[PDB]
Design an enzyme around this catalytic site. Sequence first.
Site, short mmCIF file in Angstrom:
data_model
loop_
_atom_site.label_atom_id
_atom_site.label_comp_id
_atom_site.label_asym_id
_atom_site.label_seq_id
_atom_site.Cartn_x
_atom_site.Cartn_y
_atom_site.Cartn_z
N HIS A 228 64.83 65.81 22.33
CA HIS A 228 65.38 64.50 21.88
C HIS A 228 64.31 63.61 21.33
O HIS A 228 64.49 63.01 20.30
CB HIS A 228 66.12 63.89 23.04
CG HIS A 228 66.87 62.63 22.63
ND1 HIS A 228 66.46 61.41 22.99
CD2 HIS A 228 68.05 62.46 21.96
CE1 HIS A 228 67.32 60.51 22.51
NE2 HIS A 228 68.29 61.14 21.87
N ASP A 229 63.17 63.56 21.98
CA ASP A 229 62.01 62.81 21.49
C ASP A 229 61.57 63.36 20.13
O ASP A 229 61.32 62.59 19.20
CB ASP A 229 60.81 62.88 22.46
CG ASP A 229 61.02 62.11 23.73
OD1 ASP A 229 62.04 61.50 23.94
OD2 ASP A 229 60.06 62.13 24.54
N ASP B 99 71.44 62.45 19.55
CA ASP B 99 72.03 62.02 20.85
C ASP B 99 73.03 62.98 21.33
O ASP B 99 73.04 63.35 22.52
CB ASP B 99 72.58 60.60 20.71
CG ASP B 99 71.53 59.52 20.68
OD1 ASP B 99 70.32 59.82 20.65
OD2 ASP B 99 71.94 58.33 20.63
N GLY C 120 62.95 59.27 29.05
CA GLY C 120 62.62 57.81 29.25
C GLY C 120 61.44 57.50 28.39
O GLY C 120 61.13 58.25 27.49
N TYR D 94 59.44 63.66 30.07
CA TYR D 94 59.94 63.25 28.77
C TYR D 94 61.17 62.35 28.77
O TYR D 94 61.48 61.73 27.72
CB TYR D 94 60.18 64.45 27.85
CG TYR D 94 58.89 65.08 27.47
CD1 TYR D 94 58.22 64.64 26.35
CD2 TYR D 94 58.31 66.09 28.23
CE1 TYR D 94 56.97 65.14 26.00
CE2 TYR D 94 57.09 66.63 27.88
CZ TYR D 94 56.44 66.16 26.77
OH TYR D 94 55.19 66.66 26.35
N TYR E 259 75.82 53.95 15.90
CA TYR E 259 76.61 54.96 15.20
C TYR E 259 78.01 55.00 15.84
O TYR E 259 78.20 54.54 16.97
CB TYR E 259 75.95 56.35 15.20
CG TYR E 259 75.59 56.81 16.57
CD1 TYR E 259 76.54 57.41 17.44
CD2 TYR E 259 74.28 56.69 17.08
CE1 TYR E 259 76.18 57.78 18.72
CE2 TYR E 259 73.93 57.07 18.37
CZ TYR E 259 74.90 57.65 19.17
OH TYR E 259 74.59 58.00 20.45
N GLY F 68 57.82 57.16 26.89
CA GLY F 68 56.70 58.09 26.78
C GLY F 68 57.08 59.59 26.89
O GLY F 68 58.26 60.00 27.04
N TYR G 85 64.17 62.28 17.47
CA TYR G 85 63.92 60.92 17.03
C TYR G 85 62.66 60.88 16.20
O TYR G 85 62.56 60.11 15.19
CB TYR G 85 63.75 59.96 18.18
CG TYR G 85 65.03 59.48 18.83
CD1 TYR G 85 66.29 59.95 18.47
CD2 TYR G 85 64.98 58.49 19.80
CE1 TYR G 85 67.44 59.46 19.09
CE2 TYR G 85 66.13 57.95 20.38
CZ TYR G 85 67.32 58.47 20.02
OH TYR G 85 68.48 57.97 20.65
O1 HC4 Z 1 68.53 55.23 28.44
C1 HC4 Z 1 67.36 55.14 27.96
O2 HC4 Z 1 66.69 54.04 28.03
C2 HC4 Z 1 66.75 56.35 27.40
C3 HC4 Z 1 66.86 57.56 27.94
C4 HC4 Z 1 66.18 58.68 27.24
C5 HC4 Z 1 66.84 59.93 27.22
C6 HC4 Z 1 66.23 61.00 26.51
C7 HC4 Z 1 64.96 60.82 25.93
O3 HC4 Z 1 64.45 61.89 25.28
C8 HC4 Z 1 64.28 59.59 25.98
C9 HC4 Z 1 64.94 58.51 26.61
#
Ligand code: HC4
Length: 121
Positions: A47-48, A89, A29, A27, A64, A31, A51
């Site tokens: 976190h996904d 975040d 990054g 998870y 923000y 996808g 969002y």
């Molecule tokens: O830095 C990035 O490009 C994203 C990192 C990331 C951290 C938590 C997530 O749930 C998805 C992407």
Amino acid sequence: SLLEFGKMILEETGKLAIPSYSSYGCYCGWGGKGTPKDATDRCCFVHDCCYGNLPDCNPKSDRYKYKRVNGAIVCEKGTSCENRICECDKAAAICFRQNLNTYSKKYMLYPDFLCKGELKC
Ligand SMILES: O=C(O)/C=C/c1ccc(O)cc1
């Protein structure tokens, strides 16, 4: 925004967001599928989802503002989207800090097809 998230992650953990958290597990990054690999991966799953709760915000690019009071992240008041993105975040960065004790480098660049299982937000 993604860059602010990366800076918050570095502040919290002392790890660079790229590469420590940009391609970790199932998870963290681009996808997400399957059962998260560990507690850090679970931070990214949630976190996904977080969002995902903000379909008419743009969490990657909307900036923000936050400060720290007695160490702790305090999201400052912007737009409603910005406030909600900041809370997502902040939670993930705290979660990463809480789970640094089980972070495993074997999950960096984890291959997508090994993401077996199923998890609803
Ligand atoms: O830095 C990035 O490009 C994203 C990192 C990331 C951290 C938590 C997530 O749930 C998805 C992407």
